[PDB]
Amino acid sequence: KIIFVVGGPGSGKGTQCEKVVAKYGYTHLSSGDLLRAEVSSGSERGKQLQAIMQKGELVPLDTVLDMIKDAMIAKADVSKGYLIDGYPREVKQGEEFEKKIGKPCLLLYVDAKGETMVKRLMKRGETSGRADDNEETIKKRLDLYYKATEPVIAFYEGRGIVRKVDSELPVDEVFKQVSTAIDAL
Ligand SMILES: Nc1ncnc2c1ncn2[C@@H]1O[C@H](COP(=O)(O)OP(=O)(O)OP(=O)(O)OP(=O)(O)OP(=O)(O)OC[C@H]2O[C@@H](n3cnc4c(N)ncnc43)[C@H](O)[C@@H]2O)[C@@H](O)[C@H]1O
C-alpha cells in the first residue's frame, strides 16, 4: 500500500503523517527528511542539495526518487504500507515513481490556504530556525508549489485516487478526515 501525501509548504503534511504512523502503523517517508539527512552527512552531494533547498527550488528527480526508493527498500520487510510525504512534486515524479516502484492507491491532498502556509512557516522559522523558513524562501516555495505541484493533483484526479483534507481545521479535526479516507480503503 503506497499513499502519496501532497500539499503546500507548511500545509501540515508531516503532522498528519505522524498521526497516521501512531494509529495505523504505516511507514512515513519524507523526501525533505531524506534530503536533509544527506546534507547532514557532510557529503559533497549534501552541499549541492543544501544550496538548492535554501533557495526553495526542486532537487532533481533522479536524486530524490533514488532516496525514496532506498528508504522503501530498507523498510520493505516491516512495512504494511507507506506514506510518501512530499513526493511527487511534479507530474514526471509521479510517472517515474510508477515506472520504478509501483502505483499509489491513494493520494491525500492536504489543502491549506496560501496565507495560512506563510504564517505557519514564518512561525516555525522563528521557533526552530530551519534555514528555508525565511520569508523570501517561503514565498518561492509557495510559488513553486502553485506552479509545479498542483498539476500532480490533477493527474491523480484523472486516476481517481485523490481525497482532499481541509488542513485549515485544527490538527485533530484534519486527522478525522485523514482517518476517514484511510478507513475507506
Ligand atoms: N519531491 C521533491 N522534489 C524535489 N525537491 C524536493 C522534494 N521534496 C523535498 N524537496 C526539497 O526539499 C525542500 C523541503 O521539502 P519538505 O521538507 O518537503 O518541506 P515542505 O514541503 O516545504 O513542507 P514542510 O515539511 O515545511 O511542511 P509540512 O506540510 O509537512 O507541514 P508540518 O506538518 O511540518 O506543519 C507546518 C507547521 O504548521 C503546524 N501545523 C500543521 N498542521 C496544522 C494545523 N492543522 N493547524 C495549526 N497548525 C498546524 C505544524 O505544527 C508546523 O509548525 C523543498 O522545498 C525542496 O527544495
PDB file of N, CA and C and ligand atoms in Angstrom, residues 7-16 30-33 35-36 52-53 56-60 64 85-89 93 120-121 124 130 132-133 141 167-171 174, ligand 1:
ATOM      1  N   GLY A   7       0.720  18.453  -0.679  1.00  0.00           N
ATOM      2  CA  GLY A   7       0.114  19.732  -0.171  1.00  0.00           C
ATOM      3  C   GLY A   7       1.190  20.775  -0.167  1.00  0.00           C
ATOM      4  N   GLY A   8       0.845  22.013   0.058  1.00  0.00           N
ATOM      5  CA  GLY A   8       1.902  23.055   0.006  1.00  0.00           C
ATOM      6  C   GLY A   8       2.827  23.121   1.190  1.00  0.00           C
ATOM      7  N   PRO A   9       3.842  23.966   1.097  1.00  0.00           N
ATOM      8  CA  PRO A   9       4.826  24.105   2.209  1.00  0.00           C
ATOM      9  C   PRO A   9       4.142  24.621   3.468  1.00  0.00           C
ATOM     10  N   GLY A  10       4.277  23.884   4.557  1.00  0.00           N
ATOM     11  CA  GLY A  10       3.553  24.185   5.778  1.00  0.00           C
ATOM     12  C   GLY A  10       2.095  23.852   5.830  1.00  0.00           C
ATOM     13  N   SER A  11       1.590  23.088   4.863  1.00  0.00           N
ATOM     14  CA  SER A  11       0.172  22.724   4.854  1.00  0.00           C
ATOM     15  C   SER A  11      -0.166  21.789   6.003  1.00  0.00           C
ATOM     16  N   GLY A  12       0.817  21.087   6.537  1.00  0.00           N
ATOM     17  CA  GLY A  12       0.576  20.105   7.555  1.00  0.00           C
ATOM     18  C   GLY A  12       0.782  18.635   7.196  1.00  0.00           C
ATOM     19  N   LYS A  13       1.437  18.398   6.089  1.00  0.00           N
ATOM     20  CA  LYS A  13       1.637  17.017   5.641  1.00  0.00           C
ATOM     21  C   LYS A  13       2.334  16.178   6.696  1.00  0.00           C
ATOM     22  N   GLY A  14       3.443  16.679   7.226  1.00  0.00           N
ATOM     23  CA  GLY A  14       4.267  15.914   8.205  1.00  0.00           C
ATOM     24  C   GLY A  14       3.526  15.577   9.477  1.00  0.00           C
ATOM     25  N   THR A  15       2.811  16.563   9.934  1.00  0.00           N
ATOM     26  CA  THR A  15       1.973  16.435  11.130  1.00  0.00           C
ATOM     27  C   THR A  15       0.908  15.349  10.989  1.00  0.00           C
ATOM     28  N   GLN A  16       0.154  15.385   9.890  1.00  0.00           N
ATOM     29  CA  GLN A  16      -0.787  14.334   9.594  1.00  0.00           C
ATOM     30  C   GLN A  16      -0.113  12.972   9.420  1.00  0.00           C
ATOM     31  N   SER A  30       9.663  10.859   4.296  1.00  0.00           N
ATOM     32  CA  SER A  30       9.551  12.244   3.931  1.00  0.00           C
ATOM     33  C   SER A  30      10.725  12.620   2.978  1.00  0.00           C
ATOM     34  N   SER A  31      10.452  13.114   1.766  1.00  0.00           N
ATOM     35  CA  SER A  31      11.505  13.445   0.833  1.00  0.00           C
ATOM     36  C   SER A  31      12.436  14.480   1.418  1.00  0.00           C
ATOM     37  N   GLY A  32      11.852  15.463   2.050  1.00  0.00           N
ATOM     38  CA  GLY A  32      12.552  16.563   2.752  1.00  0.00           C
ATOM     39  C   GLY A  32      13.490  16.032   3.854  1.00  0.00           C
ATOM     40  N   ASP A  33      13.012  15.081   4.663  1.00  0.00           N
ATOM     41  CA  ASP A  33      13.856  14.483   5.733  1.00  0.00           C
ATOM     42  C   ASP A  33      15.011  13.710   5.103  1.00  0.00           C
ATOM     43  N   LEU A  35      16.416  14.140   2.260  1.00  0.00           N
ATOM     44  CA  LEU A  35      17.388  15.114   1.654  1.00  0.00           C
ATOM     45  C   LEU A  35      18.232  15.787   2.735  1.00  0.00           C
ATOM     46  N   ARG A  36      17.561  16.254   3.785  1.00  0.00           N
ATOM     47  CA  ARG A  36      18.276  16.841   4.919  1.00  0.00           C
ATOM     48  C   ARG A  36      19.279  15.879   5.614  1.00  0.00           C
ATOM     49  N   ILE A  52      20.370  24.087  -3.032  1.00  0.00           N
ATOM     50  CA  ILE A  52      19.120  24.127  -3.806  1.00  0.00           C
ATOM     51  C   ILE A  52      17.928  24.357  -2.825  1.00  0.00           C
ATOM     52  N   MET A  53      17.963  23.664  -1.694  1.00  0.00           N
ATOM     53  CA  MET A  53      16.843  23.690  -0.695  1.00  0.00           C
ATOM     54  C   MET A  53      16.755  25.077  -0.048  1.00  0.00           C
ATOM     55  N   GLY A  56      14.693  27.340  -1.953  1.00  0.00           N
ATOM     56  CA  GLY A  56      13.316  26.897  -2.219  1.00  0.00           C
ATOM     57  C   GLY A  56      13.059  26.231  -3.544  1.00  0.00           C
ATOM     58  N   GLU A  57      14.084  25.677  -4.220  1.00  0.00           N
ATOM     59  CA  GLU A  57      13.866  25.073  -5.505  1.00  0.00           C
ATOM     60  C   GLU A  57      13.732  23.546  -5.389  1.00  0.00           C
ATOM     61  N   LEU A  58      13.298  22.933  -6.478  1.00  0.00           N
ATOM     62  CA  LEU A  58      13.162  21.486  -6.529  1.00  0.00           C
ATOM     63  C   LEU A  58      14.571  20.853  -6.732  1.00  0.00           C
ATOM     64  N   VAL A  59      14.902  19.857  -5.917  1.00  0.00           N
ATOM     65  CA  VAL A  59      16.016  18.977  -6.183  1.00  0.00           C
ATOM     66  C   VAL A  59      15.671  18.068  -7.375  1.00  0.00           C
ATOM     67  N   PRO A  60      16.647  17.684  -8.180  1.00  0.00           N
ATOM     68  CA  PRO A  60      16.392  16.801  -9.369  1.00  0.00           C
ATOM     69  C   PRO A  60      15.757  15.486  -8.982  1.00  0.00           C
ATOM     70  N   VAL A  64      16.110  12.600  -5.663  1.00  0.00           N
ATOM     71  CA  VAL A  64      15.011  12.408  -4.724  1.00  0.00           C
ATOM     72  C   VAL A  64      14.360  11.039  -4.811  1.00  0.00           C
ATOM     73  N   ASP A  85       5.629  11.312   1.785  1.00  0.00           N
ATOM     74  CA  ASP A  85       5.325  12.717   2.145  1.00  0.00           C
ATOM     75  C   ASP A  85       6.194  13.696   1.345  1.00  0.00           C
ATOM     76  N   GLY A  86       5.586  14.508   0.486  1.00  0.00           N
ATOM     77  CA  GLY A  86       6.394  15.468  -0.237  1.00  0.00           C
ATOM     78  C   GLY A  86       6.935  15.013  -1.552  1.00  0.00           C
ATOM     79  N   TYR A  87       6.526  13.823  -1.965  1.00  0.00           N
ATOM     80  CA  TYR A  87       6.884  13.270  -3.289  1.00  0.00           C
ATOM     81  C   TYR A  87       5.592  12.571  -3.719  1.00  0.00           C
ATOM     82  N   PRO A  88       5.081  12.782  -4.952  1.00  0.00           N
ATOM     83  CA  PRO A  88       5.687  13.651  -6.010  1.00  0.00           C
ATOM     84  C   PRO A  88       5.350  15.116  -5.952  1.00  0.00           C
ATOM     85  N   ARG A  89       6.242  15.947  -6.504  1.00  0.00           N
ATOM     86  CA  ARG A  89       6.012  17.401  -6.586  1.00  0.00           C
ATOM     87  C   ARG A  89       5.855  17.933  -7.989  1.00  0.00           C
ATOM     88  N   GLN A  93       7.657  13.265 -11.685  1.00  0.00           N
ATOM     89  CA  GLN A  93       7.980  12.497 -10.462  1.00  0.00           C
ATOM     90  C   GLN A  93       7.037  11.370 -10.149  1.00  0.00           C
ATOM     91  N   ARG A 120       2.228  29.791   9.089  1.00  0.00           N
ATOM     92  CA  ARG A 120       2.772  28.630   9.776  1.00  0.00           C
ATOM     93  C   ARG A 120       4.282  28.513   9.675  1.00  0.00           C
ATOM     94  N   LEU A 121       4.794  28.746   8.485  1.00  0.00           N
ATOM     95  CA  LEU A 121       6.216  28.636   8.226  1.00  0.00           C
ATOM     96  C   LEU A 121       7.008  29.798   8.819  1.00  0.00           C
ATOM     97  N   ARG A 124       7.234  28.786  12.386  1.00  0.00           N
ATOM     98  CA  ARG A 124       8.186  27.685  12.567  1.00  0.00           C
ATOM     99  C   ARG A 124       9.616  28.190  12.393  1.00  0.00           C
ATOM    100  N   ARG A 130      14.745  26.436  10.893  1.00  0.00           N
ATOM    101  CA  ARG A 130      15.017  25.644   9.611  1.00  0.00           C
ATOM    102  C   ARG A 130      15.370  26.635   8.519  1.00  0.00           C
ATOM    103  N   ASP A 132      15.312  27.160   5.398  1.00  0.00           N
ATOM    104  CA  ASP A 132      14.461  27.534   4.246  1.00  0.00           C
ATOM    105  C   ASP A 132      13.164  28.294   4.677  1.00  0.00           C
ATOM    106  N   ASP A 133      12.940  28.340   5.999  1.00  0.00           N
ATOM    107  CA  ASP A 133      11.796  29.027   6.631  1.00  0.00           C
ATOM    108  C   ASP A 133      12.128  30.444   6.893  1.00  0.00           C
ATOM    109  N   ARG A 141       8.951  28.923  -2.314  1.00  0.00           N
ATOM    110  CA  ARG A 141       8.430  27.568  -2.135  1.00  0.00           C
ATOM    111  C   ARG A 141       6.908  27.516  -2.465  1.00  0.00           C
ATOM    112  N   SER A 167      -6.989  21.257   5.592  1.00  0.00           N
ATOM    113  CA  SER A 167      -5.928  21.489   6.595  1.00  0.00           C
ATOM    114  C   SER A 167      -5.985  22.885   7.250  1.00  0.00           C
ATOM    115  N   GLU A 168      -7.007  23.702   6.942  1.00  0.00           N
ATOM    116  CA  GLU A 168      -7.306  24.871   7.777  1.00  0.00           C
ATOM    117  C   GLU A 168      -7.942  24.519   9.095  1.00  0.00           C
ATOM    118  N   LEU A 169      -8.520  23.339   9.245  1.00  0.00           N
ATOM    119  CA  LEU A 169      -9.041  22.919  10.580  1.00  0.00           C
ATOM    120  C   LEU A 169      -7.962  22.671  11.631  1.00  0.00           C
ATOM    121  N   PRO A 170      -8.388  22.624  12.897  1.00  0.00           N
ATOM    122  CA  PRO A 170      -7.445  22.112  13.882  1.00  0.00           C
ATOM    123  C   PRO A 170      -6.904  20.704  13.562  1.00  0.00           C
ATOM    124  N   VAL A 171      -5.730  20.417  14.093  1.00  0.00           N
ATOM    125  CA  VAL A 171      -4.913  19.269  13.698  1.00  0.00           C
ATOM    126  C   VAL A 171      -5.683  17.993  13.862  1.00  0.00           C
ATOM    127  N   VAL A 174      -8.549  17.784  11.153  1.00  0.00           N
ATOM    128  CA  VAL A 174      -7.965  17.289   9.878  1.00  0.00           C
ATOM    129  C   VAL A 174      -7.794  15.764   9.941  1.00  0.00           C
TER     130      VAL A 174
HETATM  131  N1  LIG B   1       9.773  15.656  -4.132  1.00  0.00           N
HETATM  132  C1  LIG B   1      10.699  16.639  -4.167  1.00  0.00           C
HETATM  133  N2  LIG B   1      11.279  17.001  -5.294  1.00  0.00           N
HETATM  134  C2  LIG B   1      12.182  17.932  -5.324  1.00  0.00           C
HETATM  135  N3  LIG B   1      12.585  18.589  -4.244  1.00  0.00           N
HETATM  136  C3  LIG B   1      12.123  18.268  -3.052  1.00  0.00           C
HETATM  137  C4  LIG B   1      11.148  17.231  -2.954  1.00  0.00           C
HETATM  138  N4  LIG B   1      10.811  17.093  -1.662  1.00  0.00           N
HETATM  139  C5  LIG B   1      11.533  17.959  -0.977  1.00  0.00           C
HETATM  140  N5  LIG B   1      12.297  18.688  -1.822  1.00  0.00           N
HETATM  141  C6  LIG B   1      13.229  19.788  -1.434  1.00  0.00           C
HETATM  142  O1  LIG B   1      13.235  19.845  -0.005  1.00  0.00           O
HETATM  143  C7  LIG B   1      12.678  21.084   0.455  1.00  0.00           C
HETATM  144  C8  LIG B   1      11.923  20.812   1.750  1.00  0.00           C
HETATM  145  O2  LIG B   1      10.821  19.911   1.469  1.00  0.00           O
HETATM  146  P1  LIG B   1       9.955  19.421   2.756  1.00  0.00           P
HETATM  147  O3  LIG B   1      10.677  19.118   3.994  1.00  0.00           O
HETATM  148  O4  LIG B   1       9.061  18.578   1.986  1.00  0.00           O
HETATM  149  O5  LIG B   1       9.309  20.865   3.243  1.00  0.00           O
HETATM  150  P2  LIG B   1       7.912  21.407   2.666  1.00  0.00           P
HETATM  151  O6  LIG B   1       7.041  20.695   1.729  1.00  0.00           O
HETATM  152  O7  LIG B   1       8.164  22.823   2.384  1.00  0.00           O
HETATM  153  O8  LIG B   1       6.958  21.107   3.861  1.00  0.00           O
HETATM  154  P3  LIG B   1       7.225  21.241   5.447  1.00  0.00           P
HETATM  155  O9  LIG B   1       7.601  19.905   5.831  1.00  0.00           O
HETATM  156  O10 LIG B   1       7.814  22.589   5.554  1.00  0.00           O
HETATM  157  O11 LIG B   1       5.610  21.407   5.802  1.00  0.00           O
HETATM  158  P4  LIG B   1       4.554  20.291   6.123  1.00  0.00           P
HETATM  159  O12 LIG B   1       3.416  20.488   5.174  1.00  0.00           O
HETATM  160  O13 LIG B   1       4.984  18.937   6.441  1.00  0.00           O
HETATM  161  O14 LIG B   1       3.952  20.897   7.480  1.00  0.00           O
HETATM  162  P5  LIG B   1       4.163  20.486   9.049  1.00  0.00           P
HETATM  163  O15 LIG B   1       3.303  19.340   9.299  1.00  0.00           O
HETATM  164  O16 LIG B   1       5.587  20.417   9.210  1.00  0.00           O
HETATM  165  O17 LIG B   1       3.472  21.761   9.658  1.00  0.00           O
HETATM  166  C9  LIG B   1       3.819  23.141   9.350  1.00  0.00           C
HETATM  167  C10 LIG B   1       3.671  23.943  10.667  1.00  0.00           C
HETATM  168  O18 LIG B   1       2.268  24.157  10.913  1.00  0.00           O
HETATM  169  C11 LIG B   1       1.825  23.432  12.041  1.00  0.00           C
HETATM  170  N6  LIG B   1       0.529  22.847  11.727  1.00  0.00           N
HETATM  171  C12 LIG B   1       0.337  21.738  10.952  1.00  0.00           C
HETATM  172  N7  LIG B   1      -0.965  21.497  10.804  1.00  0.00           N
HETATM  173  C13 LIG B   1      -1.597  22.472  11.483  1.00  0.00           C
HETATM  174  C14 LIG B   1      -2.973  22.744  11.774  1.00  0.00           C
HETATM  175  N8  LIG B   1      -3.905  21.968  11.275  1.00  0.00           N
HETATM  176  N9  LIG B   1      -3.263  23.838  12.497  1.00  0.00           N
HETATM  177  C15 LIG B   1      -2.297  24.608  13.032  1.00  0.00           C
HETATM  178  N10 LIG B   1      -1.013  24.391  12.850  1.00  0.00           N
HETATM  179  C16 LIG B   1      -0.631  23.337  12.087  1.00  0.00           C
HETATM  180  C17 LIG B   1       2.913  22.475  12.372  1.00  0.00           C
HETATM  181  O19 LIG B   1       2.960  22.315  13.755  1.00  0.00           O
HETATM  182  C18 LIG B   1       4.167  23.169  11.877  1.00  0.00           C
HETATM  183  O20 LIG B   1       4.581  24.179  12.824  1.00  0.00           O
HETATM  184  C19 LIG B   1      11.779  21.513  -0.699  1.00  0.00           C
HETATM  185  O21 LIG B   1      11.497  22.890  -0.628  1.00  0.00           O
HETATM  186  C20 LIG B   1      12.695  21.152  -1.881  1.00  0.00           C
HETATM  187  O22 LIG B   1      13.817  22.014  -2.033  1.00  0.00           O
END
